[PDB]
C-alpha cells in the first residue's frame, strides 16, 4: 500500500490542484526570467488588474525599486500590459495587466526558430540559415531590437548591409510588426475608451432616443476601432521610405518587435497541411503542402478580430459577427486565387502529371482539378464563388476540424468501442439508453464500461428525467446530450496542465543538477566535456542531458496539441 | 433482425459484418483499391473530381446478398443500420445520397495525431511520462 | 444495512480494496522516438532561456568577507554586468512610473 508520505513526492498530487493558466505561466516566467518577476506574473494572473502598490502590498517583495526593475524587465518582455487610469479629483495612477500572447514568444520560442529556417525559400545556404536564426533568436531574447543598436554593434558594413535588407523581407512577411500602444492596453477598456467618447460626441435634444442612438454609438465605435486595430496590424510604413542613391531603408529609429500572427497562421498551415499528409496520399498532399501557403500569407484573423473579446457578442440579432466575418471571407479578393496564380508558385520538383486518372508540366487545368478535388471533399477546405475561383473558407471549416480534432484526441485516449460511442454521441443528436442499443449494436457492457471512463470528462453531458415533479435521477432513466463546448473547454486545462508538468520536470531537474549544469555551460568547459571532467560525472552529465532532450522532445510533440483548441 | 440472437448483441457475428460492409468500397472506391498505397506514398492515383468514385446502397446490398457471408438476407433499412453502426469508428465517409469514402484507412491498418499507431509510448521506467488522466 | 445493496452485474470480491492507482496510467503516445530535428529543436531550446540568463533579464537574484584579501586585490572582476538601466529603451513604451530606473 502506498504511504501518504510516499505520495505527493512522486505522485505529485498538490501539482493536481494547481490552475493551469496561472501554474503554466508561473513556471515559465520562473524558468526564463527569475523568481521575482514569475511571483509578479502569477499575482497579476490571480488577480487581473492591480498597480504597483498592489505588488508591494501582496507579495514579500515590498521595495519600490526593485519591485520597478522586476516589472520594467517583464514589460520589456512584452509580458505585461499597462494603462494610466484618471481619477479627475485627485492624483492619478497607472494598472498593469498580463499579456497572455506576449510569453508565447518565449513559448513559441524553439518552434518560432525552426519554422524562420524552414519557411525562406533560400535555406540551403548555411551561412544565412546562421544568420537568420541568430537574428531571431536576438529579438526575441531582447523583446523589441532595433537596427539602431544592431547596425552599430555588428563590425562589418557589408554584413550590416545584409542585415538591413533581412529586416525589409520580415517586415513585409509579418514577422516583424510595428509596436505600438496596442500591444500593452486590455480589448475591453480599448473599446470603452472608444464608447465613451461617442457618447460625449451628440448634442443634446435629437429626434432619435437611446435604442438608435446606442446603436449609431456602438457602429462608430466598430469602425474607427477597425480602422485603428487594422492600421498597424499590417503596415510598410517603417520601411517605406527610401534616401538617395541607396537601398530601401527601413525607420532606424523605431523599434521592431516579432510579431506572433502569421507565425501562427504558418504553425495552423502546418497542422492543416499534417492533416493531409495523413488524410491524403503525399502525390496530391504535397500539392496541398503549398496550396495553403499561397494564402497563409495574408490569411485572416484565425479566432477574433479583437472585436469579440472587447465587448459582449449580441443579445438579440446575435448572428451579426459569424455573418459579417463570413462576408469579410467571402469579400477579400486577395484570399481569392485561380489556377493560374498558383503554377507561378509550383516547385519545379512536384510533377502533377500521374496525379489524376480522368476514368476509371505545370498545367494550370491540373492543378485547378486538385482546387475542385478540394472543395467537393467531404470536409469544406475550399469554397467555390465563381468558376474556377475558390478561397478558404472559415465560417463552417472551424467547427468541424474542433470536432475531429478532439474526437481523434478522445480516440487515442480511450478504446476504440469508445471511439465509436463519441462518434454515435456527436453525430446521433440526444441519444439514449435504447438509442445507443439501435445505432450501436456493439456489446453492451463495454460500450457502458467505456461510457464511464469517459463520464470522467468533459467529454459527455448527463440528464436528470423527472417522472414526478420532484426531481430524482433514480426513479426514472435519464438521457445524454452533446455540450460540446466543455468538451473543447476540458482540451485547454489538461494540456496546459501537462504542458506545465513538463516545465516543472525540467525546471526541478536543473534544481537538482544546478552545479553540475553551471560547471558545464561555461566557455572553455563548452565543445571540451569529455576530457576535464571525473568518470562517474561526465556519466551523469550525460544521461540527464538525455533526459532533458527527452523532455524536450516530448514538449515539442505536445506542443502540436494545444493551440488548434486555442482558436474560437 | 438476426443481430438479435439469445439476448446477446453476438461478438463475433457482428464484428465480422462491420469488416466486410467498407472492404468492398476500400476496392471500390479507389482507381485500384488498396494496391495503388501498396507500392509507397508518393506513386499512388487518384480518381478526377467529375468521376462518380462513391457508391450507392444497391451495389452494396448487391455485393453483400451475393456474398452469402452472413447467410441471411439483408432489408435497404438494415443495410442503412449497418452503415449507420460503422459510420462510426471513422469508417465510410457519409456524402449526400447515402455515399461513402475511406481516406486513411490503409494508415491505419498498416505530431499527425491521426495517425499514431506508428509512435509508441515509452516503454520504460523513465521520467516526464505524461498522461491524459493525470490532472483528474 | 447499506451492505445488501448490489447490482446484478457487480460482483463481491471487486469490492472492499479501493485505494485506487497512486497516479492514473494511460501511457500517452506523444512520447515517441527522437528525430534529428527534434534533437535539434530541443538544442534550441537549450540555447534559449539560458541567452535571456545570461543577458541582463534575470530580476530574480534576492565570499561576502569585510576583510579584502591580497589575492582578491589585483585579481580579475568577475564580469560587469550590463545594469538595466544601462540597455538602451524606448520611452514611448515604457510607463512613466517605469521611466526613473533608466538611465535617461
Same mark, same amino acid.
Given at each position: 500500500?502506498?504511504?501518504?508520505?510516499?505520495?505527493?513526492?512522486?505522485?505529485?498530487?498538490?501539482?493536481?490542484?494547481?490552475?493551469?493558466?496561472?501554474?503554466?505561466?508561473?513556471?515559465?516566467?520562473?524558468?526564463?526570467?527569475?523568481?521575482?518577476?514569475?511571483?509578479?506574473?502569477?499575482?497579476?494572473?490571480?488577480?487581473?488588474?492591480?498597480?504597483?502598490?498592489?505588488?508591494?502590498?501582496?507579495?514579500?517583495?515590498?521595495?519600490?525599486?526593485?519591485?520597478?526593475?522586476?516589472?520594467?524587465?517583464?514589460?520589456?518582455?512584452?509580458?505585461?500590459?499597462?494603462?494610466?487610469?484618471?481619477?479627475?479629483?485627485?492624483?492619478?495612477?497607472?494598472?498593469?495587466?498580463?499579456?497572455?500572447?506576449?510569453?508565447?514568444?518565449?513559448?513559441?520560442?524553439?518552434?518560432?526558430?525552426?519554422?524562420?529556417?524552414?519557411?525562406?525559400?533560400?535555406?540551403?545556404?548555411?551561412?544565412?540559415?546562421?544568420?537568420?536564426?541568430?537574428?531571431?533568436?536576438?529579438?526575441?531574447?531582447?523583446?523589441?531590437?532595433?537596427?539602431?543598436?544592431?547596425?552599430?554593434?555588428?563590425?562589418? *558594413?557589408?554584413?550590416?548591409?545584409?542585415?538591413?535588407?533581412?529586416?525589409?523581407?520580415?517586415?513585409?512577411?509579418?514577422?516583424?510588426?510595428?509596436?505600438?500602444?496596442?500591444?500593452?492596453?486590455?480589448?475591453?477598456?480599448?473599446?470603452?475608451?472608444?464608447?465613451?467618447?461617442?457618447?460625449? #460626441?451628440?448634442?443634446?435634444?435629437?429626434?432619435?432616443?437611446?435604442?438608435?442612438?446606442?446603436?449609431?454609438?456602438?457602429?462608430?465605435?466598430?469602425?474607427?476601432?477597425?480602422?485603428?486595430?487594422?492600421?498597424?496590424?499590417?503596415?510598410?510604413?517603417?520601411?517605406?521610405?527610401?534616401?538617395?542613391?541607396?537601398?530601401?531603408?527601413?525607420?532606424?529609429?523605431?523599434?521592431?518587435?516579432?510579431?506572433?500572427?502569421?507565425?501562427?497562421?504558418?504553425?495552423?498551415?502546418?497542422?492543416?497541411?499534417?492533416?493531409?499528409?495523413?488524410?491524403?496520399?503525399?502525390?496530391?498532399?504535397?500539392?496541398?503542402?503549398?496550396?495553403?501557403?499561397?494564402?497563409?500569407?495574408?490569411?485572416?484573423?484565425?479566432?477574433?478580430?479583437?472585436?469579440?473579446?472587447?465587448?459582449?457578442?449580441?443579445?438579440?440579432?446575435?448572428?451579426?459577427?459569424?455573418?459579417?466575418?463570413?462576408?469579410?471571407?467571402?469579400?477579400?479578393?486577395?484570399?481569392?486565387?485561380?489556377?493560374?496564380?498558383?503554377?507561378?508558385?509550383?516547385?519545379?520538383?512536384? *510533377?502533377?502529371?500521374?496525379? %489524376?486518372?480522368?476514368?476509371?508540366?505545370?498545367?494550370?487545368?491540373?492543378?485547378?482539378?486538385?482546387?475542385?478535388?478540394?472543395?467537393?471533399? =467531404?470536409?469544406?477546405? %475550399?469554397?467555390?464563388?465563381?468558376?474556377?475561383?475558390?478561397?478558404?473558407?472559415?465560417?463552417?471549416?472551424?467547427?468541424?476540424?474542433?470536432?475531429?480534432?478532439?474526437?481523434?484526441?478522445?480516440?487515442?485516449?480511450?478504446?476504440?468501442?469508445?471511439?465509436?460511442?463519441?462518434?454515435?454521441?456527436? *453525430?446521433?443528436?440526444?441519444?439514449?439508453?435504447?438509442?445507443?442499443?439501435?445505432?450501436?449494436?456493439?456489446?453492451?457492457?463495454?460500450?457502458?464500461?467505456?461510457?464511464?471512463?469517459?463520464?470522467?470528462? =468533459?467529454?459527455?453531458?448527463?440528464?436528470?428525467?423527472?417522472?414526478?415533479?420532484?426531481?430524482?435521477?433514480?426513479?426514472?432513466?435519464?438521457?445524454?446530450?452533446?455540450?460540446?463546448?466543455?468538451?473543447? =473547454?476540458?482540451?485547454?486545462?489538461?494540456?496546459?496542465?501537462?504542458?506545465?508538468?513538463?516545465?516543472?520536470?525540467?525546471?526541478?531537474?536543473?534544481?537538482?543538477?544546478?552545479?553540475?549544469?553551471?560547471?558545464?555551460?561555461?566557455?572553455?568547459?563548452?565543445?571540451?566535456?569529455?576530457?576535464?571532467?571525473?568518470?562517474?560525472?561526465?556519466?551523469?552529465?550525460?544521461?540527464?542531458?538525455?533526459?532533458?532532450? #527527452?523532455?524536450?522532445?516530448?514538449?515539442?510533440?505536445?506542443?502540436?496539441?494545444?493551440?488548434?483548441?486555442?482558436?474560437? | 433482425?438476426?443481430?438479435?440472437?439469445?439476448?446477446?448483441?453476438?461478438?463475433?457475428?457482428?464484428?465480422?459484418?462491420?469488416?466486410?460492409?467498407?472492404?468492398?468500397?476500400?476496392?471500390?472506391?479507389?482507381?485500384?483499391?488498396?494496391?495503388?498505397?501498396?507500392?509507397?506514398?508518393?506513386?499512388?492515383?487518384?480518381?478526377?473530381?467529375?468521376?462518380?468514385?462513391?457508391?450507392?446502397?444497391?451495389?452494396?446490398?448487391?455485393?453483400?446478398?451475393?456474398?452469402?457471408?452472413?447467410?441471411?438476407?439483408?432489408?435497404?433499412?438494415?443495410?442503412?443500420?449497418?452503415?449507420?453502426?460503422?459510420?462510426?469508428?471513422?469508417?465510410?465517409?457519409?456524402?449526400?445520397?447515402?455515399?461513402?469514402?475511406?481516406?486513411?484507412?490503409?494508415?491505419?491498418?498498416?505530431?499527425?495525431?491521426?495517425?499514431?499507431?506508428?509512435?509508441?509510448?515509452?516503454?520504460?521506467?523513465?521520467?516526464?511520462?505524461?498522461?491524459?488522466?493525470?490532472?483528474? | 444495512?447499506? +451492505?445488501?445493496?448490489?447490482?446484478?452485474?457487480?460482483?463481491?470480491?471487486?469490492?472492499?480494496?479501493?485505494?485506487?492507482?497512486?497516479?492514473?496510467?494511460?501511457?500517452?503516445?506523444?512520447?515517441?522516438?527522437?528525430?534529428?530535428?527534434?534533437?535539434?529543436?530541443?538544442?534550441?531550446?537549450?540555447?534559449?532561456?539560458?541567452?535571456?540568463?545570461?543577458?541582463?533579464?534575470?530580476?530574480?537574484? +534576492?565570499?561576502?568577507?569585510?576583510?579584502?584579501?591580497?589575492?582578491?586585490?589585483?585579481?580579475?572582476?568577475?564580469?560587469?554586468?550590463?545594469?538595466?538601466?544601462?540597455?538602451?529603451?524606448?520611452?514611448?513604451?515604457?510607463?512613466?512610473?517605469?521611466?526613473?530606473?533608466?538611465?535617461?
Amino acid at each position: 500500500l502506498v504511504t501518504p508520505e510516499d505520495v505527493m513526492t512522486i505522485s505529485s498530487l498538490e501539482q493536481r490542484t494547481l490552475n493551469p493558466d496561472l501554474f503554466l505561466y508561473k513556471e515559465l516566467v520562473k524558468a526564463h526570467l527569475g523568481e521575482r518577476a514569475a511571483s509578479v506574473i502569477g499575482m497579476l494572473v490571480a488577480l487581473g488588474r492591480l498597480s504597483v502598490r498592489e505588488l508591494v502590498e501582496k507579495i514579500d517583495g515590498m521595495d519600490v525599486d526593485s519591485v520597478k526593475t522586476t516589472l520594467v524587465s517583464l514589460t520589456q518582455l512584452r509580458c505585461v500590459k499597462y494603462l494610466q487610469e484618471t481619477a479627475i479629483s485627485g492624483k492619478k495612477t497607472t494598472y498593469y495587466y498580463y499579456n497572455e500572447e506576449g510569453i508565447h514568444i518565449l513559448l513559441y520560442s524553439g518552434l518560432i526558430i525552426d519554422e524562420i529556417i524552414t519557411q525562406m525559400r533560400v535555406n540551403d545556404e548555411e551561412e544565412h540559415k546562421q544568420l537568420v536564426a541568430e537574428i531571431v533568436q536576438n529579438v526575441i531574447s531582447l523583446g523589441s531590437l532595433t537596427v539602431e543598436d544592431y547596425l552599430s554593434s555588428v563590425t562589418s *558594413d557589408s554584413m550590416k548591409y545584409t542585415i538591413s535588407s533581412l529586416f525589409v523581407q520580415l517586415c513585409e512577411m509579418g514577422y516583424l510588426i510595428q509596436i505600438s500602444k496596442l500591444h500593452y492596453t486590455p480589448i475591453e477598456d480599448l473599446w470603452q475608451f472608444l464608447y465613451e467618447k461617442h457618447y460625449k #460626441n451628440i448634442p443634446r435634444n435629437s429626434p432619435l432616443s437611446d435604442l438608435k442612438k446606442r446603436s449609431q454609438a456602438k457602429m462608430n465605435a466598430k469602425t474607427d476601432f477597425a480602422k485603428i486595430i487594422n492600421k498597424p496590424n499590417e503596415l510598410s510604413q517603417i520601411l517605406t521610405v527610401d534616401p538617395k542613391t541607396s537601398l530601401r531603408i527601413v525607420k532606424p529609429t523605431v523599434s521592431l518587435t516579432i510579431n506572433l500572427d502569421r507565425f501562427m497562421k504558418g504553425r495552423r498551415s502546418k497542422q492543416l497541411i499534417n492533416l493531409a499528409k495523413t488524410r491524403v496520399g503525399s502525390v496530391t498532399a504535397q500539392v496541398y503542402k503549398i496550396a495553403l501557403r499561397l494564402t497563409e500569407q495574408k490569411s485572416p484573423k484565425i479566432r477574433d478580430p479583437l472585436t469579440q473579446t472587447g465587448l459582449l457578442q449580441d443579445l438579440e440579432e446575435a448572428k451579426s459577427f459569424q455573418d459579417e466575418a463570413e462576408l469579410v471571407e467571402e469579400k477579400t479578393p486577395g484570399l481569392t486565387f485561380n489556377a493560374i496564380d498558383l503554377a507561378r508558385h509550383l516547385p519545379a520538383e512536384l *510533377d502533377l502529371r500521374g496525379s %489524376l486518372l480522368s476514368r476509371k508540366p505545370h498545367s494550370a487545368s491540373l492543378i485547378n482539378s486538385h482546387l475542385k478535388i478540394l472543395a467537393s471533399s =467531404n470536409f469544406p477546405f %475550399l469554397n467555390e464563388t465563381k468558376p474556377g475561383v475558390y478561397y478558404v473558407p472559415y465560417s463552417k471549416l472551424m467547427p468541424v476540424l474542433k470536432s475531429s480534432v478532439y474526437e481523434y484526441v478522445i480516440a487515442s485516449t480511450l478504446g476504440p468501442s469508445a471511439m465509436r460511442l463519441s462518434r454515435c454521441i456527436r *453525430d446521433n443528436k440526444l441519444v439514449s439508453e435504447k438509442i445507443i442499443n439501435s445505432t450501436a449494436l456493439m456489446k453492451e457492457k463495454d460500450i457502458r464500461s467505456t461510457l464511464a471512463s469517459l463520464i470522467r470528462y =468533459n467529454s459527455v453531458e448527463i440528464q436528470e428525467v423527472p417522472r414526478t415533479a420532484d426531481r430524482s435521477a433514480s426513479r426514472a432513466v435519464f438521457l445524454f446530450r452533446c455540450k460540446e463546448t466543455h468538451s473543447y =473547454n476540458f482540451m485547454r486545462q489538461n494540456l496546459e496542465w501537462n504542458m506545465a508538468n513538463l516545465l516543472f520536470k525540467k525546471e526541478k531537474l536543473k534544481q537538482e543538477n544546478s552545479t553540475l549544469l553551471k560547471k558545464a555551460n561555461r566557455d572553455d568547459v563548452k565543445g571540451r566535456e569529455n576530457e576535464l571532467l571525473l568518470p562517474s560525472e561526465l556519466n551523469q552529465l550525460k544521461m540527464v542531458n538525455e533526459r532533458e532532450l #527527452n523532455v524536450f522532445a516530448r514538449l515539442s510533440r505536445l506542443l502540436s496539441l494545444w493551440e488548434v483548441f486555442q482558436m474560437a | 433482425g438476426p443481430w438479435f440472437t439469445d439476448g446477446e448483441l453476438d461478438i463475433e457475428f457482428i464484428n465480422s459484418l462491420l469488416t466486410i460492409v467498407w472492404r468492398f468500397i476500400s476496392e471500390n472506391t479507389f482507381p485500384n483499391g488498396f494496391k495503388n498505397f501498396e507500392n509507397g506514398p508518393k506513386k499512388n492515383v487518384f480518381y478526377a473530381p467529375n468521376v462518380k468514385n462513391y457508391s450507392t446502397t444497391q451495389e452494396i446490398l448487391e455485393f453483400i446478398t451475393a456474398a452469402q457471408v452472413a447467410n441471411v438476407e439483408l432489408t435497404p433499412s438494415n443495410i442503412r443500420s449497418l452503415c449507420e453502426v460503422l459510420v462510426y469508428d471513422d469508417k465510410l465517409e457519409k456524402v449526400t445520397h447515402d455515399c461513402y469514402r475511406v481516406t486513411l484507412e490503409s494508415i491505419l491498418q498498416m505530431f499527425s495525431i491521426f495517425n499514431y499507431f506508428k509512435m509508441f509510448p515509452a516503454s520504460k521506467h523513465d521520467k516526464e511520462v505524461v498522461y491524459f488522466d493525470e490532472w483528474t | 444495512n447499506y +451492505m445488501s445493496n448490489l447490482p446484478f452485474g457487480l460482483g463481491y470480491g471487486d469490492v472492499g480494496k479501493n485505494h485506487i492507482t497512486e497516479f492514473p496510467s494511460i501511457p500517452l503516445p506523444i512520447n515517441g522516438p527522437i528525430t534529428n530535428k527534434e534533437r535539434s529543436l530541443a538544442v534550441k531550446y537549450i540555447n534559449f532561456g539560458k541567452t535571456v540568463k545570461d543577458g541582463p533579464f534575470y530580476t530574480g537574484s +534576492m565570499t561576502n568577507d569585510g576583510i579584502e584579501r591580497y589575492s582578491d586585490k589585483y585579481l580579475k572582476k568577475r564580469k560587469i554586468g550590463i545594469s538595466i538601466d544601462d540597455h538602451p529603451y524606448n520611452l514611448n513604451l515604457f510607463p512613466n512610473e517605469l521611466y526613473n530606473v533608466m538611465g535617461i
